[model samples]
Target chain A: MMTVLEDMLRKTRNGKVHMTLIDPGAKPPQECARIAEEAEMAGTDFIMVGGSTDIDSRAMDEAISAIKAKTDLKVIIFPGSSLMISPKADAIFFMSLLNSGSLEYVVGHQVKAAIPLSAMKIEKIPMAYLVFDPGMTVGRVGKAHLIPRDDEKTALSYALAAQYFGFRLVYFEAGSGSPYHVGENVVRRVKQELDIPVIVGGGIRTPEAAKALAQAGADMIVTGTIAERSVNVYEALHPIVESIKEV
Target chain B: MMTVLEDMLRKTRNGKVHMTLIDPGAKPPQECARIAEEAEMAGTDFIMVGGSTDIDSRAMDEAISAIKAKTDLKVIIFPGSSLMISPKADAIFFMSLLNSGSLEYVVGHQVKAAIPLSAMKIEKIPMAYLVFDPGMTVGRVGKAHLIPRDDEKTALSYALAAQYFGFRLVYFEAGSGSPYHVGENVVRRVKQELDIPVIVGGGIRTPEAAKALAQAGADMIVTGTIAERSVNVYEALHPIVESIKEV
Candidate 1:
């Protein structure tokens, strides 16, 4: 059995980071595939495919196949749920919405994904996903009441739980289309409390923000909504990846 | 016992329409309260606060009070989970995100809310809140793996169960920030299948779209993201309300 995300993480140093998000819901499979190919070609280290809450299983499969067909890079299913999975991806971010009281996203969805993944033989990287509310219209409407981003003690506690739960990665997300990026102070606090890999995403619109987060303590940085508008992210991100590697 | 939502339907001939929506996260209690007041003032007959998967009790309470202070109009809590409740609101849309496999949102939170509501003498309107994933980014990253909005048959079956469970309202949310609205066909199908009031919201950005949905058999039409952005929503929505009333 080969380690998947662990092996990928080995490619980077303690703080080196690189990621690109593929929202199949907006672009559909065909568009996503083309973008995935372009991202891989542009030197993105990994591709995360999934959208907010709904996953079209067939669309997800098609997107994965399209990307796999064109690129040699690792394609991971950062699944919103079991429904988003496809055997074509290299691994799955077996996520638990740690901030939510909903047990399904925390454990139920994981259990549902386990049986299928076992049969399909996909690698699973358990992730404690902590989402902070950014006080935007979407955040209010999406219904995740969001733990306030400024609450460092609560964040550290959740990160500690992730560490205790044996999750290899702790993802701090300011839900998609968030008005505020996860604050630097929150990142600093959580990192001080946990020894695991820290992956940050959801609203890092620029490379300067990405670099700041990476330097602050994020082991991996993810960029999503910004990618939808332009193909210029590669130039913005390449230097951050190198900066983390150099130090 | 007070007539709660069940009796509200009994008095209306054209069928009562309700729209449930999620609000943006990260705002302080004061800010959230201000938004709620603004929503109530903007011709929202009612404001149902909650979204796909998270709830903050204190923030919710503040929002309810703020809205209540400004408007005698109905203010209800569409809790992400039952724990986010306040007596300040006229009623609570005692919701079970039935489409959610998550036990907490499905039952756990309800159980917790029931005892407090009983003790506090808050009005509870048993509601079936169904989230239809409308292909948005927040749903995937926040991981609210809800049922698909386009699946009429599934939505119909859920409506039937809600009716059988004796719920007075069936909310069909296309989700906040959705690129597409829930189709008219699904709305008609669900309404036709269940005798109760049907609430539809999420992505109803245009006055024409909102009017079309009300005509399509939705008892209530909800618009949040759009209405909040514009100062002219009251004028724009007047026609939609008139259309629903005429129906």
Candidate 2:
């Protein structure tokens, strides 16, 4: 609670944030380390693990060890299930998918993990999560009732709900590898209505896209969409982070 | 986790559940004891304290001590804020107000309490709490967008979200002394969709009213209206329990 939340929030106050999502299930520990090492150097501010599916503790442990060993960036676990949690990380997004059609995404896994997580040193930041269509794999997995893309009013209501519920931040997810990212209209409205930091992810493929979202007042831009396919990871990521800073 | 959740869920398996609502902030410790002692014999399966307003540990401590001293029923704290917590209870409703227009009700207060509660022995049960109109005092205080009383579809959607989100239970709170309780149509539909317990409270003034809800598939019935105004607490509560048990 002290170090991770304090450090994460402090940095957020200074400028727009950028995080690299590394799904341990998607790559070998060393490959994960390579991305973590490069992303930080490329101007990404944080390393996030497990926004992908079917992550287990052993996978979580090794990936964390390699990343923390390979880079200075703190690793935050953005879990999809209770089993993905490990004590090796600096922070955990104690998130609830506010619009999920299923209970596991909303509170079940969280309740099961609640007690076990208390004993760990990882900082727990309450996050309010919303998924927008064309919702990708995570949306289907979470059973999210995906918010209509560009329905600024509906999107803003969810963010406002999260902010009022006292989440430290609000993340509008369009799902990894989505056909399109969350609408800039949605981001703009949510950011204007909420006092909390607004983190936008998914479908952000260009620096121009990231720049527009940042200019629309997003506080954080998270990209795993780029981390998976890019040949030169740093070259691809540097400008997305750089774009947000330009705003 | 083991004893309280196991006990609560087990009894829920046998038959309909009836719980007495007692606000520690509303009555004297001895008076709270008087009602808990009566309600147990009168047929309540449990006692819930503090579904009303501001609750501090000091008030909770005394009220719990007296009730436990006089009755065999377990005390389940329905907390409104972080400061309302005390280690003395058998269990706590670790709840989230999904439709609250504020963040404190959504996750912040729960985040502040999560770790601290884990250290204590009390069982923490995750609950999804929805407020419906004639939205009582609690709704305004919570900044709830009160669901219209007869909007069965909207109400059911919220319950489904809670069930999918993995809440142990879903509570339809019309607020204390609300003009009416949650609609039977809403209760029936939510109960049909959810695997978890459905707890209904507020504005229920009669045994017949309680019986209708229980028959409509409500797993649990909670009534505090009698505790605050009745000259004979047991007399007022006895028939409601008897009526639901008949179902």
Candidate 3:
């Protein structure tokens, strides 16, 4: 089956896609549902749900179901672990921390999550998840080696490996709440070398930064902390969507 | 209900207990079953079934069921992720990589596994899992900061935190195939301050090393690589068992 993500990717090849990450643990289900609605209205192509820690399954299910009930945007799970597999979502990013020093992050967790994910018939979009310098919470949690933001060769090597390994996408994550987004040079270098789509996220607090990353070669740009922490979620999302879509 | 792990811990307080980790992915299920039988014959008190990478649930189930069918030893799951959970095992080391920089490894995985684990009615032994220096596979994978092998204060702080957090056991892992086990000083210091049982493993290739770690205050000693790599599993384990029991 052509998954929702695949269809979205096909439709947005020339233009950039904007995604909003909603952490279920960070807010109540009702708030998450409301945020999903607002994010969709503001031009988010997809709603990524899940968090790095303290994920309550009930809350996650509620949030996913609400997103599904409230919007036409695809609800894709950016899971922290196997437990985050919710059948309520349209699909899941079957992510592997490619730069992780431990094998568990690279494939162990995926192996464990495979069956449940398969049983749920959740469309699995294989993603090579990499974290770059000054690694934030996801980097630390994933135990990634953190490719030097200046090292294009190393970043490309990992990205190349991901494509060779049959991953559909390569995500260059700076980590959630990071002070900086993945360097544009690194993203550009990786994108130039791979046939698959490249995703950039973390530390992208401004529309300008989102635009820069999208222009640098991010097919999809994800914003979470910025919108989640904003006093007005719509206001926070407006510029980001505007900036990326302009690319 | 007193878990087999709890009972084993109670029974071996004066001496030391020996556990063997059988990686199902490292070998076929039949070989894993044979190794489990041999490990039991060699005096392993408990069998820990799981792996750091490439964990196949069907193979794991086969290995666990085979061990249960072939031996009287308690089969505990040292899971790589929530998917490694099996009802066939007597208990699970419901471990959180305490020193992990990511909340997912620390608690995210546990929350995800809780429901299935509860439904399975498996004994959940809360363990604080820590990794020490050069930060081998598990340490790197777990995203642990790798407590300096010589840094007693740092290691002790994590152990104390584990205790304060109410974990039943504190495990100091050196990573599979590490050239060194967790340092004696760090282990001794952590054990001295914490009231809970301390389990140590990794890079223990010799009986003397096992003996030293046990004497240094490790309540249980786990050996995997040495036994798995040895020409004869029994021969490799026999002396290590003897040395640890003497403690």
Return whichever of 2 and 3 wins on TM-score. 2
Q: What shift in Å separates residue B80 of candidate 1 from its native position after superposition?
A: 27
Candidates 1 and 3 compared by DockQ, better number = 1
lDDT, residue B109, model 2: 69
lDDT of each: 0.65, 0.80, 0.78
lDDT of 3 by residue, B34-92 (tens): 88888998999898887777776777888888888888888888877536888788988
Candidate 3, what DockQ?
Answer: 0.02
Query: What is the model-wide C-alpha lDDT for candidate 3?
Result: 0.78
Tens-digit per-residue lDDT, A81-151, candidate 2: 64577888888888888777765676556656654664576776778888889778888888888889898
- Model 1 chain A weakest lDDT span, ten residues long: A135-144
Model 3 has a clash total of 2
Q: Of 1 and 3, which scores higher on TM-score?
A: 3
Model 2: how far residue A43 lies from native, Å = 1.3
Residue-level error in angstroms, candidate 2, position B202: 11
